[PDB]
Amino acid sequence: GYSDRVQQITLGNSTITTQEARNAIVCYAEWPEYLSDNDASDVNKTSKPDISVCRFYTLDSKTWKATSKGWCWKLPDALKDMGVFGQNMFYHSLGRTGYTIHVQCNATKFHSGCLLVVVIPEHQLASHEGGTVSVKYKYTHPGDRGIDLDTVEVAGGPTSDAIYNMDGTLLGNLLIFPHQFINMRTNNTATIVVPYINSVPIDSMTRHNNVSLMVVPIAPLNAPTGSSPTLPVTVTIAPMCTEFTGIRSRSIVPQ
C-alpha cells in the first residue's frame, strides 16, 4: 500500500513530511558515516553533539517569479547561525558533516514549471570581472541568504550566469552531479542525502565550503489565469553525522 511519493524524515526533534515526492538521491550511492580511525590523522577526540545539531533547520524562503534565474547556497555556510550547529561551527578548529537537503515547492494542477535541484561538490565560482580577480570571501559566505542569481553583479562577486553555472561550464551538463527535479505536474519536493566528500579527513568549516546547493528554474513558472504569478521556494536542511574538533576560543571571521 505504501508509495514512493509519501515520505517522512525524522531527524532529532524535527519531522518532515511529503505526499508528493519523487524518490530521493543518495549522493554517489553513499550514506553519511563518521570518520574512521583508518582515515583519521588528527589525534584529537571528536565531539558528537548528536540530536542537537543533527536536526532540520529551515532557511529563509525564496520567491519563484516567472523571470527568476536561480539561487545558490554554500554549505556549511548557510547553516552558520543555526542554533547549536552554528555555535559548534565557530568554537572548533575543524568539523565534518553530511546533510539531508529538502527543497519544497507546492502548486496547482494548473501550473507548469520545472526546477533543477542540484548539489555540487567544490563549486568554485567565477568572478564578475574575470581575469585574475578572485571572488571575495564575503560573497561566497552570504550565510542563509545565499546567492540570488538575478541580483545585479558587484565588483569582486560571482557572475550571475545560470547558463554558465557561474563557473564556465554549461547548465545542461549539471546533471552529472547528484540532482533532482521539481516538476510541478509531478513533484512537490526534492530530497538529497549528501555524504562527506573531501580530499582531507576533516577540515575547516569556515574557510571552505564543501558543496553548494543550487535551485535553478529551467522551465519558467506559468501560473493559471487569474492566479498569483509567484510561488515561494523553501529549503530545509539537516546536518547528519556531525563531528567537531580543535575546540578553543571563538573563530574570528570577516565582517
Partner 1 sequence: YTVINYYKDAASSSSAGQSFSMDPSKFTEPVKDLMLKGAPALN
Partner 2 sequence: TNDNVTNYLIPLHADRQNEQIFGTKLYIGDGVFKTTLLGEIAQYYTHWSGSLRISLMYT
Partner 3 sequence: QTLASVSSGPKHTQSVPALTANETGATLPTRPSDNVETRTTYMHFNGSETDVESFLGRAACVHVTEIKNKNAAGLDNHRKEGLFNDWKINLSSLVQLRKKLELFTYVRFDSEYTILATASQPEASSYSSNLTVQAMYVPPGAPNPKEWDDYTWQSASNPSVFFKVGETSRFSVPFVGIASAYNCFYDGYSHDDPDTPYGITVLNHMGSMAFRVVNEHDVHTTIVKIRVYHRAKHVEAWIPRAPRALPYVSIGRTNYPRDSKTIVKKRTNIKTY
- Which residue in 153, 158, 148 sits closest to 217, CA to CA? 148
108 binds partner 2 (CB under 8 A): no
45 binds partner 3 (CB under 8 A): yes
Cell numbers placing 29: 550511492
Query: Which residues, numbered 82-111, are part of the site for partner 1 (CB under 8 A)?
Result: none
Q: Rounded to 5 degrees, what are φ and ψ at 80?
A: -70, -5
Is 76 in contact with 209 (CB distance < 8 Å)? yes
Least Å distance between CB 248 and partner 2? 13
Choose the one of partner 3, partner 2, a copy of itself, none that binds residue 159, judging by a C-beta under 5 to 8 angstroms depending on kind. partner 3
Label residues 91-119 b or e (16+ Cβ within 10 Å = b): bbbbbbbbbbbbbbbbbeeebbbbbbbbb
Choose the one of a copy of itself, partner 3, partner 1, none that binds residue 66, judging by a C-beta under 5 to 8 angstroms depending on kind. none
- Name the maximum alpha-carbon separation found in the chain: 63
- In the list 66, 84, 154, 200, the residue contacting partner 3 (rule: CB under 8 A) is 200
Count of Cβ atoms closer than 10 Å to residue 192 Cβ: 22
- In the list 3, 41, 173, 199, the residue contacting partner 1 (rule: CB under 8 A) is 3
CA 50 – CA 48 distance, rounded (Å):
5
Query: Which residues, numbered 27-86, are part of the site for a copy of itself (CB under 8 A)?
Result: 44-45, 47-52, 55, 83-84
CA 209 – CA 192 distance, rounded (Å):
17
186 binds partner 1 (CB under 8 A): yes
Interface with partner 2 (CB under 8 A): 41, 43, 61, 63, 228, 232
Interface with a copy of itself (CB under 8 A): 12-13, 44-45, 47-52, 55, 83-84, 87-88, 91-92, 244, 247, 249
